[PDB]
Amino acid sequence: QISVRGLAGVENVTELKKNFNRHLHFTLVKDRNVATPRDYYFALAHTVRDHLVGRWIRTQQHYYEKDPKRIYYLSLEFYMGRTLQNTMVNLALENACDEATYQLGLDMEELEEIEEDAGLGNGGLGRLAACFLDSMATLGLAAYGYGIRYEFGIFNQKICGGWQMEEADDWLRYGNPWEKARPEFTLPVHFYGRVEHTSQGAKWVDTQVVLAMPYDTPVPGYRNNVVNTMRLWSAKAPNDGYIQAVLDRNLAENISRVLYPNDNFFEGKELRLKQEYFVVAATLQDIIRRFKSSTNFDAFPDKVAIQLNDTHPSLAIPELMRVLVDLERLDWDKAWEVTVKTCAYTNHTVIPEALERWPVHLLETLLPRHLQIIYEINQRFLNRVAAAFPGDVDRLRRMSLVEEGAVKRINMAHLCIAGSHAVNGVARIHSEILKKTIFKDFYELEPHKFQNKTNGITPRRWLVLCNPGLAEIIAERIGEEYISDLDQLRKLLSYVDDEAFIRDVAKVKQENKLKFAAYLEREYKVHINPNSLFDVQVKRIHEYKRQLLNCLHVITLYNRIKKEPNKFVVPRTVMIGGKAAPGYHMAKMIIKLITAIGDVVNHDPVVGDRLRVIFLENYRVSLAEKVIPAADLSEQISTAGTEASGTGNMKFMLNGALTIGTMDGANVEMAEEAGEENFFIFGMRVEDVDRLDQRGYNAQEYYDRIPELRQIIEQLSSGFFSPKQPDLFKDIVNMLMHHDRFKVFADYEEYVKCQERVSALYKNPREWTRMVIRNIATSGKFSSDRTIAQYAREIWGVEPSRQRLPA
Amino acid sequence: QISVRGLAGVENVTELKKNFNRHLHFTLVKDRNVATPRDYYFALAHTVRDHLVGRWIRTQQHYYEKDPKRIYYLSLEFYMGRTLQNTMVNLALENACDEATYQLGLDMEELEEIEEDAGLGNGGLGRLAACFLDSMATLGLAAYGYGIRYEFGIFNQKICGGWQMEEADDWLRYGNPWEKARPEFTLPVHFYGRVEHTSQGAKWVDTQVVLAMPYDTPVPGYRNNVVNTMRLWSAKAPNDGYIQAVLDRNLAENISRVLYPNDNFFEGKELRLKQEYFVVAATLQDIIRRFKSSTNFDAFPDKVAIQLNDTHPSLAIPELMRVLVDLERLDWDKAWEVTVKTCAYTNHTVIPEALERWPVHLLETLLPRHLQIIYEINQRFLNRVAAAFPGDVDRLRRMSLVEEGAVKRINMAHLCIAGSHAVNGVARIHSEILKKTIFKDFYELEPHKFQNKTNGITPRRWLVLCNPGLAEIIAERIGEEYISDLDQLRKLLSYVDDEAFIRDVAKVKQENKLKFAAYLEREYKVHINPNSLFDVQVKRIHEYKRQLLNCLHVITLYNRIKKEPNKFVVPRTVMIGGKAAPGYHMAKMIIKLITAIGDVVNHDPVVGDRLRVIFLENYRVSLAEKVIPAADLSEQISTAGTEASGTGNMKFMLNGALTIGTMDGANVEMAEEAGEENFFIFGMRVEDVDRLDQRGYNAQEYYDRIPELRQIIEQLSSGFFSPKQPDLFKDIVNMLMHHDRFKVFADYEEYVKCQERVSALYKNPREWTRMVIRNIATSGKFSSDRTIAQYAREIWGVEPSRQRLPA
Numbered sequence A, B: 001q002i003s004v005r006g007l008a009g010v011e012n013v014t015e016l017k018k019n020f021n022r023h024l025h026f027t028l029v030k031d032r033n034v035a036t037p038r039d040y041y042f043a044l045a046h047t048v049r050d051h052l053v054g055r056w057i058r059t060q061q062h063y064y065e066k067d068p069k070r071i072y073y074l075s076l077e078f079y080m081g082r083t084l085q086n087t088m089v090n091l092a093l094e095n096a097c098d099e100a101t102y103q104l105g106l107d108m109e110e111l112e113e114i115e116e117d118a119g120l121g122n123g124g125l126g127r128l129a130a131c132f133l134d135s136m137a138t139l140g141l142a143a144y145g146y147g148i149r150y151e152f153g154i155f156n157q158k159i160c161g162g163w164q165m166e167e168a169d170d171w172l173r174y175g176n177p178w179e180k181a182r183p184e185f186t187l188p189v190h191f192y193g194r195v196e197h198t199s200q201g202a203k204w205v206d207t208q209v210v211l212a213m214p215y216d217t218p219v220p221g222y223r224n225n226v227v228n229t230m231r232l233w234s235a236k237a238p239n240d241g242y243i244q245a246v247l248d249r250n251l252a253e254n255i256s257r258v259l260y261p262n263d264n265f266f267e268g269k270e271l272r273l274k275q276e277y278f279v280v281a282a283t284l285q286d287i288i289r290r291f292k293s294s295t296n297f298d299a300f301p302d303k304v305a306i307q308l309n310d311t312h313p314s315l316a317i318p319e320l321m322r323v324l325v326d327l328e329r330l331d332w333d334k335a336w337e338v339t340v341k342t343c344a345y346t347n348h349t350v351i352p353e354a355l356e357r358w359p360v361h362l363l364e365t366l367l368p369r370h371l372q373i374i375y376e377i378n379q380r381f382l383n384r385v386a387a388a389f390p391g392d393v394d395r396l397r398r399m400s401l402v403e404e405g406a407v408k409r410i411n412m413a414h415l416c417i418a419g420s421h422a423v424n425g426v427a428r429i430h431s432e433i434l435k436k437t438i439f440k441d442f443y444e445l446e447p448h449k450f451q452n453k454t455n456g457i458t459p460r461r462w463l464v465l466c467n468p469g470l471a472e473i474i475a476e477r478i479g480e481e482y483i484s485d486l487d488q489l490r491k492l493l494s495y496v497d498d499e500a501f502i503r504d505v506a507k508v509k510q511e512n513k514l515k516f517a518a519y520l521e522r523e524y525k526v527h528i529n530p531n532s533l534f535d536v537q538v539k540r541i542h543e544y545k546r547q548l549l550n551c552l553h554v555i556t557l558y559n560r561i562k563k564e565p566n567k568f569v570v571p572r573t574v575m576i577g578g579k580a581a582p583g584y585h586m587a588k589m590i591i592k593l594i595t596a597i598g599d600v601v602n603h604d605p606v607v608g609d610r611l612r613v614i615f616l617e618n619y620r621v622s623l624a625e626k627v628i629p630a631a632d633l634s635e636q637i638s639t640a641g642t643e644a645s646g647t648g649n650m651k652f653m654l655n656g657a658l659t660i661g662t663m664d665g666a667n668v669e670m671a672e673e674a675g676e677e678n679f680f681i682f683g684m685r686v687e688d689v690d691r692l693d694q695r696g697y698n699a700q701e702y703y704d705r706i707p708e709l710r711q712i713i714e715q716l717s718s719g720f721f722s723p724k725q726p727d728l729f730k731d732i733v734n735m736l737m738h739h740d741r742f743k744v745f746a747d748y749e750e751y752v753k754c755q756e757r758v759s760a761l762y763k764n765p766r767e768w769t770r771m772v773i774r775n776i777a778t779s780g781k782f783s784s785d786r787t788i789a790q791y792a793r794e795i796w797g798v799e800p801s802r803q804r805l806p807a
């Protein structure tokens, strides 16, 4: 036992054991002689869940009595990962459960590995929602997460012949012990139909109804006895040839069947639009119901805050208007005032292909009334623009919520800005770019709406839970208070010259690496050298994230070794992992290239154990918890101006890895906090990128001037990495040479040079560790508690509280 | 409190209460201030379920240790109804739970009404399976019920404008506390593919796989601590555009989506065939697995008995052969010997349109290997016939498993007889008819195979549970032993002249009628006179059951009243209820006719409260438990030779109703047991029916000779019962006059006369009750415990046991 895991009291352990046996018997209907590890996992899960119940019921009862302003976080993604360990940590039950299971003859880690990840998200945006829920509970806010209970989350990735294969993520197969179905709270959602204009107001009729059934999952705060709720909706068909009619119910229920895995290119698919309205319509009725139980909607914004995670739930704006105007009978102007003061929008990217632009004909058929409301919103908004900038007809077309052209579309981002009192970017540089480029016109019209809220990650899951060894040595010296006040890590700077601490920091990292190296062999049968530098790049596969630039460096290292075999080089294990969206051809070709490189490099006798290339299969939250604590070097190399913020970068910094990256997204603030001397910065800044675009990017120039780069391209073209299929990577070479929107070649030279400096420092164990200490010590700003406290104070208008609850 | 409901001990009640509160808190995650009646129902349900667990685990553990011969009852239908009260009764917890809930300020009856019926059956055949499970557990047999877990059971019937409307039976919406999912025991089921003939045996390849996930439901015996299992399979797709692929999983899972409600006409639908193989394939693998854990399959028949409930699971025969021959490598002759000794078949009807005759092209595409096995079975069987009856070529074509003609079909009944060591009818007269007509050729070839097993009903649900008042007065005089030894009711004959008993029997019936009369107003807002004779006919709507004959009598009574308004007539409340299969036009027209008659009769001032016609909506198991105890007259009027047995008839006899009926099915044995003087028998016997068919049935003859009958037909034709739609019932009149396969007119005169005798007896309260006592006293033979004991001894080769288990 380690301290930060709580106390293992005698009667506490005694109680856990009897309840464990009680659940195995009564709940699982099992007996010790036939129970399997999975059965034991569920017994433990139900045992821990029991401890949540009392707190969950009184927290909600408390909000009913106090009636504080309620925060509603709307998102179509909640990348939760596993729940068991996180629950024990927040309830201070980890050591007790560890002891209790030990006495029962069971290994708790083994049991924890049985839980399926709740992968209801694609990557950053979904995981941000998850960290936010944790921080909002830890800060005592009356917050509710609202989304969709997908029967199938992000697909499980299988690598066959070096290619990605997608497999259904049937995460509910064995059941979900954490959720509680609330069929009694089912609500109706309407689709299609037509709008009738009677004497007194518009009426939406002849609609098809789909029921929204909620499932509640508890969200425990960190040791403050606060347990908030994450409510996820499931689609159900109303009960009203016979056989075919029953079988056709599936049509309606398909709405909550699966998570769309396309995080790169917006697809105007009808099913996706249905999902977006489904979550919005059910959620708003729930919100209003709770409000009416606290008819003067003037106080609505004082009791309700709705945060839109990107434009995915943007229909909340016209839906709130529909309800207030059509159902509650408020006049337009009043309803609009309430709507704007209630809603706030968060943008996550400036890349055009990711922005939602719904075809008018789709909204016309599916949501006829909302389209009319959107047109009216646009009309009134443009009248305001026309009055502020008389005669500027071009601005009018640019700011319109309706885009003209081949097919008319609705720009959901413009809709969100017009209908929100606050719009924020997720990193200082990103928020600035929003004001200077993409949303410049809106900023000039309403400057007060634009804010910045730099992202963060929760130190519970991303430190205490996944790196107990590091959390312990830190606590030994500054206490446990930093876990909910991460800024305290700064006190660690006074230990940068402490020989003992330096030794412990390095020991923990070594232990994490051996632990991960072992895992690689157990569950994947691959052998790596634990003494090599762990060079890691894990995140979804995208051209802008430039996994390709990493590949070029790897090949360069390989070619240099083959050039001078007996020359010493710092050993490296290069790990790249991440999923590619199913229809993203280039991303899939990049995964293939990575494995192809490994096939050559990992079997070259001359290389030995000096260089290894491994593709981490099925990267997901639970895998991130294993690899991040074991990393030495974090690759954050997106083209300057493309990664809005990034969050994986923060996870690595908090866990003892140094960072090599561009001045993009949050990397800028990270370097600023730790000091540029303690970061491995390289490449073009946003300004350099622009200037290059003015001139015109010509990749051929770099190819002609850099011999090493030329050699790599020729190897790719000639089939050096694909003997049986010589032209296998022709698409990659053609993209790099003629239409690379992300300028991979432009940063190649500086990148390779920077990597040499990384290797130089790694050769000096003591100085590498001292730099690590300086990074960990200054990672405090990146806690989602800080992010949430800012949202609370500057956007929602509520004060966070660290005050514990009762028992 | 009443005796037969067990003791309400102090610490037993104390324990139930604390566990009730524990579940409401920890399981339902609720608090007393927001809990609804449904929440209380679930808390109680989980509380009672807890008491089942210990017994369930040791009963199964016991079978593993003793290793007795195992009985497998295969059925595509299990009409279970509600489980809460039945569980309390069998566990002797009813009074304790009643007291415990009372002390908590709750009414247990109210809570019991919240449970949804598990309606996984159509009628008699499905309910028989349910009663059988109860008796097998009560008799200590190591029995397992195997079927399909339909997401939607028999449709809920709504009557709109007098017409039947079907509504999806979403019985799992709020969850099922009685079942335990066993995903760890999932098995693969194969479909389609092709057969490869290699060197060593045939091979079924290129198949599509569908997973079978089992859900176990406990089946408690009556106070013997035995808890058997009913295992129901659910269809799941294997995990191996992306979105569409995931959505298409529904195709595979549609197999267990809904129960086919067509109990009248066989439809060769592919989905139904898939359901039949699905249950058979998953079940047999489970059976074999359990056997191999008890490779000499010679002892297989000594450890396994498979009972086929009708031909629906007949594929078990060729599937067992497939496994033994193709997988286990036994030679054909040996495998066949094992198969025959293992399987037994039960027939439920002689009506040709109900018999399963699958088109060869369907089996050819879906189950190619089974078709080959069936052909081989047929070939060897016909060689035996040819040898026993040399030169009888006609017999060869008649007995073939393959029917020639427009489209080749497989006669599943012939397959079942050839592959079973026992074939039984469900009532003496039915079994005889099987041997004389439909299966005459098979009987002559193998007389030893044919048996009779007269049906029965369980006295727990059909007496103790639904009629506690009657069960109590009986117990007061002869004890409680009759509940599991129904033959003891005969001792009641010595009380036929007991003035006290006569008074109590009549009092209970009166109380049941007032109780039902009240229910009719509460949940259906209809007022009836509790002092009238309750004339009831409840069962599925079929032409052979002749609800139409009942209608003719009702109209006759109405016309007689209108004829002589001031003439005294015994008051009657005629209740008819039952569902019509969705595609059965005539059955739906009959329901409409019933309501139409009520619309006229119930609003005629001259009739007053002397005659009322009510159609009991949504007849199902839970409704049967309410109306049967309240009935005075039971209508069992099927055309002689058409109702194989009937079971509703037995339920009425056990609950104090007199019976008016034909000498059909079990009615014959019932009259034989009680004495014909104590039964209201009328109409043609089977012999009379045949003779009429020889001559030729001419309905016109009856129409011309019976004035009262002529008047009714003219009223129907002229639109007397359908003013706005004069020809609404032209199809009914046309059927009755020109093509009535069931000779409604032929029994009309005798039926009306018999009904007059019923009314005459009802006018003498004392003599009516004495006759009732003679019926109840002789209903012992109709307990499913007797039926099951006979199956056990004469077919399965096992001895029933009344010995209790431990605790």
Ligand SMILES: Nc1ccc(C(=O)NC(=O)N[C@@H]2O[C@H](CO)[C@@H](O)[C@H](O)[C@H]2O)cc1
Pocket: A122, A123, A124, A125, A126, A128, A262, A263, A264, A266, A348, A349, A354, A426, A455, A643, A644, A645, A646, A647, A665
């Ligand atoms: N239709 C979709 C569906 C999903 C996405 C999506 O997942 N997008 C992202 O995750 N974006 C990521 O969200 C993170 C959290 O703010 C940022 O730090 C990161 O820079 C951004 O790229 C984008 C569009």
Ligand SMILES: Nc1ccc(C(=O)NC(=O)N[C@@H]2O[C@H](CO)[C@@H](O)[C@H](O)[C@H]2O)cc1
Pocket: B122, B123, B124, B125, B126, B128, B262, B263, B264, B266, B348, B349, B354, B426, B455, B643, B644, B645, B646, B647, B665
């Ligand atoms: N394809 C199907 C589906 C369902 C059925 C069906 O439910 N049949 C019956 O219920 N038949 C009934 O089964 C009872 C139990 O033995 C008998 O007493 C009764 O006489 C018989 O008609 C018949 C064919």
Ligand SMILES: O=c1[nH]cnc2c1ncn2[C@@H]1O[C@H](COP(=O)(O)O)[C@@H](O)[C@H]1O
Pocket: A057, A060, A061, A064, A290, A293, B031, B033, B034
């Ligand atoms: O009418 C009410 N009376 C008492 N408590 C209530 C009432 N409505 C809500 N509550 C409490 O408030 C919690 C919040 O429920 P919500 O509507 O899901 O937010 C409930 O679980 C109850 O504890």
Ligand SMILES: O=c1[nH]cnc2c1ncn2[C@@H]1O[C@H](COP(=O)(O)O)[C@@H](O)[C@H]1O
Pocket: A031, A033, A034, B057, B060, B061, B064, B290, B293
């Ligand atoms: O290998 C075994 N060891 C000990 N008990 C067993 C074993 N296999 C089955 N059992 C017991 O037998 C019960 C019957 O399981 P079944 O296979 O579903 O019939 C199980 O719940 C166990 O109690």
Ligand SMILES: *Cc1c(COP(=O)(O)O)cnc(C)c1O
Pocket: A122, A123, A124, A127, A538, A539, A540, A619, A620, A621, A624, A645, A646, A647, A648, A649, A651
């Ligand atoms: C933190 C996280 C992300 C986001 O990583 P970035 O490098 O910021 O894109 C994506 N996936 C998982 C599973 C994560 O844990």
Ligand SMILES: *Cc1c(COP(=O)(O)O)cnc(C)c1O
Pocket: B122, B123, B124, B127, B538, B539, B540, B619, B620, B621, B624, B645, B646, B647, B648, B649, B651
């Ligand atoms: C007993 C029962 C039946 C069978 O009734 P019969 O009159 O024999 O056809 C049908 N339905 C239900 C719900 C039953 O309880």
